[PDB]
Design a protein around this motif. Structure first.
Motif, PDB file in Angstrom:
ATOM      1  N   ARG A  11      43.069  72.223  72.754  1.00 50.72           N
ATOM      2  CA  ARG A  11      43.494  71.219  73.875  1.00 50.72           C
ATOM      3  C   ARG A  11      42.411  71.278  74.982  1.00 50.72           C
ATOM      4  NH1 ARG A  11      46.323  70.327  78.684  1.00 50.72           N
ATOM      5  NH2 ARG A  11      45.963  72.498  79.097  1.00 50.72           N
ATOM      6  N   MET A  12      41.415  70.254  74.848  1.00 49.83           N
ATOM      7  CA  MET A  12      40.198  70.141  75.647  1.00 49.83           C
ATOM      8  C   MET A  12      39.669  68.723  75.261  1.00 49.83           C
ATOM      9  SD  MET A  12      37.547  72.952  74.249  1.00 49.83           S
ATOM     10  CE  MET A  12      36.283  72.281  75.176  1.00 49.83           C
ATOM     11  N   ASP A  13      38.497  68.321  76.157  1.00 54.19           N
ATOM     12  CA  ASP A  13      37.812  67.145  75.801  1.00 54.19           C
ATOM     13  C   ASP A  13      36.854  67.509  74.884  1.00 54.19           C
ATOM     14  OD1 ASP A  13      36.012  65.038  75.993  1.00 54.19           O
ATOM     15  OD2 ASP A  13      35.451  65.567  78.163  1.00 54.19           O
ATOM     16  N   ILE A  14      36.825  66.666  73.484  1.00 53.98           N
ATOM     17  CA  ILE A  14      36.141  66.849  72.288  1.00 53.98           C
ATOM     18  C   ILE A  14      34.577  66.335  72.846  1.00 53.98           C
ATOM     19  CG2 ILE A  14      36.440  64.182  71.854  1.00 53.98           C
ATOM     20  CD1 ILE A  14      36.556  64.887  68.908  1.00 53.98           C
ATOM     21  N   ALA A  15      34.212  65.777  73.806  1.00 54.12           N
ATOM     22  CA  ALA A  15      32.934  65.813  74.288  1.00 54.12           C
ATOM     23  C   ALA A  15      31.961  67.176  74.600  1.00 54.12           C
ATOM     24  CB  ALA A  15      32.684  64.862  75.325  1.00 54.12           C
ATOM     25  N   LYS A  16      33.095  68.330  74.723  1.00 53.43           N
ATOM     26  CA  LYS A  16      32.485  69.611  74.858  1.00 53.43           C
ATOM     27  C   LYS A  16      32.797  70.599  73.777  1.00 53.43           C
ATOM     28  CE  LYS A  16      34.440  69.885  79.941  1.00 53.43           C
ATOM     29  NZ  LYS A  16      35.342  70.674  81.006  1.00 53.43           N
ATOM     30  N   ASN A  17      32.934  69.908  72.526  1.00 52.68           N
ATOM     31  CA  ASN A  17      33.006  70.501  71.141  1.00 52.68           C
ATOM     32  C   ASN A  17      32.152  71.549  70.856  1.00 52.68           C
ATOM     33  OD1 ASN A  17      31.270  69.769  68.679  1.00 52.68           O
ATOM     34  ND2 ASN A  17      31.775  67.590  69.736  1.00 52.68           N
ATOM     35  N   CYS A 146      43.037  67.632  71.020  1.00 55.41           N
ATOM     36  CA  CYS A 146      43.912  67.024  71.663  1.00 55.41           C
ATOM     37  C   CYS A 146      44.049  67.166  73.143  1.00 55.41           C
ATOM     38  CB  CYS A 146      45.439  67.313  71.094  1.00 55.41           C
ATOM     39  SG  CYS A 146      45.858  68.839  71.321  1.00 55.41           S
ATOM     40  N   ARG A 147      44.817  66.530  73.964  1.00 57.01           N
ATOM     41  CA  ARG A 147      44.842  66.562  75.519  1.00 57.01           C
ATOM     42  C   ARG A 147      46.397  67.041  75.823  1.00 57.01           C
ATOM     43  NH1 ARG A 147      40.040  64.786  77.959  1.00 57.01           N
ATOM     44  NH2 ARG A 147      40.814  66.334  79.557  1.00 57.01           N
ATOM     45  N   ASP A 148      47.308  66.762  74.951  1.00 58.51           N
ATOM     46  CA  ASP A 148      48.630  67.278  75.468  1.00 58.51           C
ATOM     47  C   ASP A 148      49.075  68.441  75.236  1.00 58.51           C
ATOM     48  OD1 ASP A 148      51.684  65.434  76.451  1.00 58.51           O
ATOM     49  OD2 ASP A 148      51.584  67.037  74.714  1.00 58.51           O
TER      50      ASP A 148
HETATM   51 CL   LIG Z   1      38.169  69.773  79.223  1.00 59.18          CL
END
Ligand SMILES: [Cl-]
Ligand SMILES: [Cl-]
Ligand SMILES: [Cl-]
Length: 163
Positions: A11-17, A146-148
């Protein structure tokens, strides 16, 4: 391929994968868009050169040597439930072909058509099941973003149930 191919959820921003490539939840026109698409545009803008592709398809564009797989899920505000279901399954089959072609050992992927293209409906199970149908035959480690908080728990439960 990965030695013991797995599915994980974060659960985090995919831009930081932390994976070898990313799947963008793209629009057909290759525009910066919103949600995942806008985060991808900010992190890998070079990958939007000639990234336009039709609904139900995936098109990969490199940002340096890092692959960005632009996958276009249907917008359920425009499609019927039947036609949209078919295009959503098709977009994920094209992601599996691109991940295989690239030879990567891992891929970061969002749930297509679950945000502003959902037509105001909860499509977690629909989208995740089409993701599994396409990716199960690949040997890359898949990390779903995901973010939720409630969606993280439900995706994690669906992954664990099958092991
Ligand atoms: Cl994040
Ligand atoms: Cl979306
Ligand atoms: Cl989410």
């Amino acid at each position: 391929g990965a030695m013991a191919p797995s599915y994980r959820v974060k659960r985090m921003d995919i831009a930081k994968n932390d994976e070898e490539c990313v799947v963008n939840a793209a629009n057909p026109r290759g525009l910066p868009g919103d949600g995942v698409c806008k985060a991808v545009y900010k992190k890998w803008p070079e990958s939007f050169k000639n990234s336009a592709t039709p609904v139900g398809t995936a098109k990969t564009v490199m940002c340096g040597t890092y692959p960005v797989i632009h996958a276009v899920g249907p917008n359920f505000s425009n499609y019927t439930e039947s036609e949209g279901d078919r295009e959503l399954a098709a977009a994920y089959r094209e992601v599996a072909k691109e991940v295989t072609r690239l030879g990567v050992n891992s891929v970061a992927i969002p749930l297509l058509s679950t945000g502003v293209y959902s037509g105001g409906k909860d499509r977690l199970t629909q989208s995740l099941n089409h993701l599994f149908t396409a990716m199960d035959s690949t040997d890359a480690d898949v990390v779903i973003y995901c973010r939720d908080k409630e969606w993280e728990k439900k995706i994690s439960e669906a992954i664990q149930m099958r092991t």
